[PDB]
Design an enzyme around this catalytic site. Structure first.
Site, PDB file in Angstrom:
ATOM      1  N   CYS A  93       8.404 -91.078  29.034  1.00  0.00           N
ATOM      2  CA  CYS A  93       8.238 -89.969  28.411  1.00  0.00           C
ATOM      3  C   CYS A  93       7.551 -89.961  27.017  1.00  0.00           C
ATOM      4  CB  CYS A  93       9.658 -89.057  28.392  1.00  0.00           C
ATOM      5  SG  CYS A  93      11.020 -89.675  29.270  1.00  0.00           S
ATOM      6  N   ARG A 122      16.329-101.643  30.057  1.00  0.00           N
ATOM      7  CA  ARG A 122      17.597-101.114  29.588  1.00  0.00           C
ATOM      8  C   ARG A 122      18.592-102.186  29.266  1.00  0.00           C
ATOM      9  NH1 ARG A 122      17.944 -94.992  32.598  1.00  0.00           N
ATOM     10  NH2 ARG A 122      15.705 -94.619  32.075  1.00  0.00           N
ATOM     11  N   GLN A 140       9.923 -97.480  37.315  1.00  0.00           N
ATOM     12  CA  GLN A 140      10.211 -96.108  37.768  1.00  0.00           C
ATOM     13  C   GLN A 140       8.918 -95.312  38.387  1.00  0.00           C
ATOM     14  OE1 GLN A 140      13.456 -94.350  34.794  1.00  0.00           O
ATOM     15  NE2 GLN A 140      11.268 -93.951  34.280  1.00  0.00           N
ATOM     16  N   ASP A 142       7.686 -92.568  38.207  1.00  0.00           N
ATOM     17  CA  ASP A 142       8.104 -91.482  37.059  1.00  0.00           C
ATOM     18  C   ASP A 142       6.674 -90.702  36.613  1.00  0.00           C
ATOM     19  OD1 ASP A 142       9.437 -90.372  34.944  1.00  0.00           O
ATOM     20  OD2 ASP A 142       8.935 -91.610  33.393  1.00  0.00           O
ATOM     21  N   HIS A 144       5.793 -86.798  34.292  1.00  0.00           N
ATOM     22  CA  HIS A 144       6.229 -85.704  33.291  1.00  0.00           C
ATOM     23  C   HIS A 144       5.350 -84.513  33.542  1.00  0.00           C
ATOM     24  CE1 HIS A 144       8.019 -89.060  31.710  1.00  0.00           C
ATOM     25  NE2 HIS A 144       9.126 -88.155  31.470  1.00  0.00           N
ATOM     26  N   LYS A 224      20.248 -82.440  34.635  1.00  0.00           N
ATOM     27  CA  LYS A 224      19.480 -83.333  35.617  1.00  0.00           C
ATOM     28  C   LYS A 224      20.046 -83.206  37.043  1.00  0.00           C
ATOM     29  CE  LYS A 224      21.888 -87.496  35.169  1.00  0.00           C
ATOM     30  NZ  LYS A 224      22.098 -88.884  35.339  1.00  0.00           N
ATOM     31  N   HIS A 270      10.831 -83.649  33.851  1.00  0.00           N
ATOM     32  CA  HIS A 270      10.994 -85.366  34.073  1.00  0.00           C
ATOM     33  C   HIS A 270      11.278 -85.438  35.531  1.00  0.00           C
ATOM     34  CE1 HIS A 270      11.982 -86.276  29.751  1.00  0.00           C
ATOM     35  NE2 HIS A 270      12.193 -85.043  29.581  1.00  0.00           N
TER      36      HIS A 270
END
Ligand code: TSB
Ligand code: TSB
Ligand code: ZN
Ligand code: ZN
EC number: 6.1.1.3
Lengths: 401, 401
Positions: A93, A122, A140, A142, A144, A224, A270
Site C-alpha cells: 500500500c 513478515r 499477494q 494485491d 488498492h 476487513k 485494499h
C-alpha cells in the site's frame, strides 16, 4: 491431503532451515504460480486495473508516517545502508500511494484501481509457520483502489464480485466470511471506524453474504472482510480480503481536485482476491489432492515410446504439441512402459500418450489419463484441440469425465 | 536522449529519497518490463530452460560457505530474526544450487539449465547510483547451467548464441565484448582460473567474436565474458554476461552420479542475457529515444474523436482493438486535434487513429504515426491485422517505414 507431502511428491517446492518460511519454488510449482498470475491478470483487465511494481524496501520515516512503525514493528524486517534505516515491505500500500502521488490527480481519475503481484515479507514467529499456508515471504495478488466516499459501495461490490467469480473457477462456492472490526492498536478516530465498519457490513448484507463479526481482528488501518477457505484438517485460512482505509491516504499526503475544484483526500480500498499465491496454492493442492485441473497442471501431457524405435515419432509429436501451447514432455527412458505410466500417474500428469509401432505407422496415439482411464486411439489433432479447449475454458474436469 | 528525462515524459517510473536506487515502476514502465519477460521466456522455452523462484533471503551461514561473506560483504544487505542473521540475496546462484540439491541427480539430468527472473539487492554506494542503469534493487534475467566439464564448450557456445540472438531483436550496432580475468580477491586455485579463463577465450574465438581483456575484473568465483552496451553519452554498461564457476558447486555440496557410477561435482555456468531488466530498459530507452518498437510500447494505439459526436464510435473501436489484444486508449477530450496529436507524439504512441464524422460514417479510421506520418484512411480490420503482425514479429519498424 497434506499439501506439504504432495508438494514433495510432485516436486513443486521445498523449504530449508537456512530460510525458515522462505519458499524455493521448483520449476513445476513455479509453473502453477505463473498460471495463477495469468488468470488474475485476465480477470483484472475486465476492470481496467493498472499494474505496477513498488520498491522492496523504503526508509523508516515512511513507515513511521503510515503507522506501521508503531503498530506493525514486530512483523517487519529492517536493514540499513549509509546510516539510514529501512524496512523491507510487509505490505504494498505505501508504495502504491507513492505512485498515486506522482502527477496531479482529479476526480476524473477516480476510481483508480492499482494492482501489483507484491512480494511481502513478515517476520512471523517461527512456531506459527506452516507449509505454504503461513510463510515469511509471499506474493499477494494485491490492489488498492483510490476512490471517493460516494464510490465506496460500487468499488467494494466490484471486489466482492471478483472474489466469487474467481473462486468459482476452482470450485469454491461455499465461503465462510468474517467482518473483523477495530483492533486495540489502531489509527484513526472512532467516528471513522464506525463509518467504515458500517460500510462493510452493509456491503455484505446487500450481497446476501452470511458473515460473522470478529472482535478486534481488523487491520490497524481499517476494518476487513475475510474470505475463509479450509484445509484438509478443517483449519480456517484467510484468503481473499477487502479492507476500508480512511487513514493512510491522509498520512501520506494523497489528494485530488474535486469537481468543486477543491482539494480532497481519496478513500483507499485494499484487497487481495486469492490472498497470497503461496497460501492459495497450498489450499488448491489440498483441495485437488495434487490432481490440478489441466490448465494449472505443471505438465499437461507426457508422450512415451515403448522402444527406441518410436523415439523419432515421440519427439515429433512433442514438438508439435509444444508449438500448440501445451506443456508437454517426452519420456524416452529405457524403462518398461508400465513403469513410465505409473510414474506419470503418480505425478498427476493429466494425459499420457503411448506410442508403439502401431501408433507410428498409423499417425495416431494411445491415450490414458491419470485417473487410469483408457481413452483408446485418438488422432493427434483431435487431442490437441480437446486439450486447448480444456485449457482455454480452465475446466475442472478432463476428457470424458 | 537521457532515459531519466524520457522516463518522466512517458510516465514510466520514478524514484525518490525514501528508497535510494529502488525503482517505482508505473503502469507504463511495468508494461515494458513485462513484455521483456514474455520475450525472454519465449527464448528460454526454445533453448530448454526450467524457470524457478528462490527466496529473497537466506541464513548468513550459507553466504559464508559460498564465499560471499568474505568477498562480497559490502554489497550485501543484512537483517535478522529470532537470534539468526540473514542476507538479502545479491545473486540467485546459491538459491539455484539449493534447488539442484533437492533430489538425487544423475549425469542423465545434465546439462540442467535453471533460469529465474531474480530480484537482487546490492548496497551500491549512493554516489554511484544512476537512473535505471545502476540501482540497488534490480531483476536479472538470470540462469545457472549445471553441466559436466565435457559439456562446457557446447553450453557456453549456447549462451553466446543466445546473446546475439536476443540482441538482434533490438538492432544494437555497438556491442563490445570483454573477458574479465581473475580479481585480487578470489576463491579457487590458480590452476582452476587458468582453465576457466582459457575455456571462455576459446569459446569466444570459436564463435569468431573479437574481444578485449579486462584484467582483474572477473567475479570472485570465476572469469566473465561481458557484453557491453552503450548509452547516449557513449558510457559503457555491462549487460549480458557469461561466467564459468568451478567453486560454488563444491562449496555447496552439489553432486551427481556419473556414468562410472561415481559421485561427481557439476560445473556451473552463470549467465544473464539482458543483464538486469532495469539497466536493459535504460539502454533501450536511450537507444530508441523513447520510440519503443510497437511490441514494447506501453500504449500502442490512441483513438481520438474531434467532438463528442464521435465518442460512441471511438469507444466501440477501442473495445474492439482491446479485444484483439492491442494496448489501446481512447482520447475523447474536448481539445484541438492538433494538440491531441502533439501530446501523444510526446508520449511516443506508435499509432493514432483520428475519428471525425466521415470516419464514423465510413466505418474507417484516419491513421497517423508518432513520426508525423499520415497513413491515410484504413479499414479497422486491416489496421488490426497489420498491428498484430508488427507485434507478433517484434518488428523494429512501423507501417510504411
Ligand atoms: C490486502 C492488502 O492490500 C493488505 N495490505 C494486506 O496486506 N492485507 S493482509 O495483511 O490481510 O494480507 C493479504 C493476504 O495475504 C495473505 N497472507 C498474509 N500473511 C501471510 C503469510 N504469513 N503467509 C502467507 N500468506 C499470507 C493472506 O491470504 C491475506 O488475506
Ligand atoms: C549472471 C549472474 O548469474 C551472476 N551471479 C551475476 O550476478 N553477475 S553480475 O554480478 O555481473 O550481474 C549480472 C548483471 O546484472 C546487472 N547488474 C548488476 N549490478 C547492477 C546494478 N547495480 N544495477 C543494475 N543492473 C545491475 C548487469 O547487467 C550485470 O551484467
Ligand atoms: Zn494494502
Ligand atoms: Zn550466478
Amino acid at each position: 491431503r497434506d499439501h506439504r507431502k504432495i508438494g514433495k511428491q510432485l516436486d513443486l517446492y521445498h523449504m530449508q532451515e537456512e530460510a525458515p518460511g522462505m519458499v524455493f519454488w521448483h520449476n513445476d510449482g513455479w509453473t502453477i504460480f505463473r498460471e495463477l498470475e495469468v488468470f488474475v491478470r485476465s480477470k483484472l483487465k475486465e476492470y481496467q486495473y493498472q499494474e505496477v511494481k513498488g520498491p522492496f524496501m523504503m526508509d523508516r520515516v515512511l513507515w513511521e508516517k503510515t503507522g506501521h512503525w508503531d503498530n506493525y514493528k514486530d512483523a517487519m524486517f529492517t536493514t540499513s545502508s549509509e546510516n539510514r534505516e529501512y524496512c523491507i515491505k510487509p505490505m504494498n500500500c505505501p508504495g502504491h500511494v507513492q505512485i498515486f502521488n506522482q502527477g496531479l490527480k482529479s476526480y476524473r481519475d477516480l476510481p483508480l484501481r492499482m494492482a501489483e503481484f507484491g512480494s511481502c515479507h513478515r517476520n512471523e514467529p517461527s512456531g506459527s509457520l506452516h507449509g505454504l499456508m503461513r510463510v515469511r515471504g509471499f506474493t499477494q495478488d494485491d490492489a488498492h483502489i483510490f476512490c471517493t466516499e460516494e464510490q465506496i459501495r460500487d468499488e467494494v461490490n466490484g471486489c466482492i464480485r471478483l472474489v466469487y467469480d474467481m473462486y468459482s473457477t476452482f470450485g469454491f462456492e461455499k465461503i465462510v466470511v468474517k467482518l473483523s472490526t477495530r483492533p486495540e492498536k489502531r489509527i484513526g478516530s472512532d467516528e471513522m471506524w464506525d463509518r467504515a465498519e458500517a460500510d462493510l457490513a452493509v456491503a455484505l448484507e446487500e450481497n446476501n453474504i452470511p458473515f460473522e463479526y470478529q472482535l478486534g481482528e481488523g487491520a490497524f488501518y481499517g476494518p476487513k472482510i475475510e474470505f475463509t477457505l479450509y484445509d484438509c484438517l478443517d483449519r480456517a485460512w484467510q484468503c481473499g480480503t477487502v479492507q476500508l482505509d480512511f487513514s493512510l491516504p491522509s498520512r501520506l499526503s494523497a489528494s485530488y481536485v474535486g469537481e468543486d475544484n477543491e482539494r480532497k483526500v481519496p478513500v483507499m480500498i485494499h484487497r487481495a482476491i486469492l490472498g497470497s499465491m503461496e497460501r492459495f496454492i497450498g489450499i488448491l493442492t489440498e483441495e485437488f489432492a495434487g490432481f490440478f485441473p489441466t490448465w494449472l497442471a505443471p505438465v499437461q501431457v507426457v508422450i512415451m515410446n515403448i522402444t527406441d524405435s518410436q523415439s523419432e515419432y515421440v519427439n515429433e509429436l512433442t514438438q508439435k504439441l509444444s508449438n500448440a501451447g501445451i506443456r508437454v514432455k517426452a519420456d524416452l527412458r529405457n524403462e518398461k512402459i508400465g513403469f513410465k505410466i505409473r510414474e506419470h500417474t503418480l505425478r498427476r500428469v493429466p494425459y499420457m500418450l503411448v506410442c508403439g509401432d502401431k501408433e507410428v505407422e498409423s499417425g495416431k496415439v494411445a491415450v490414458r489419463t491419470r485417473r487410469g482411464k483408457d481413452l483408446g486411439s485418438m488422432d493427434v489433432n483431435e487431442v490437441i484441440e480437446k486439450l486447448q479447449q480444456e485449457i482455454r475454458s480452465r475446466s475442472l474436469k478432463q476428457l470424458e469425465e
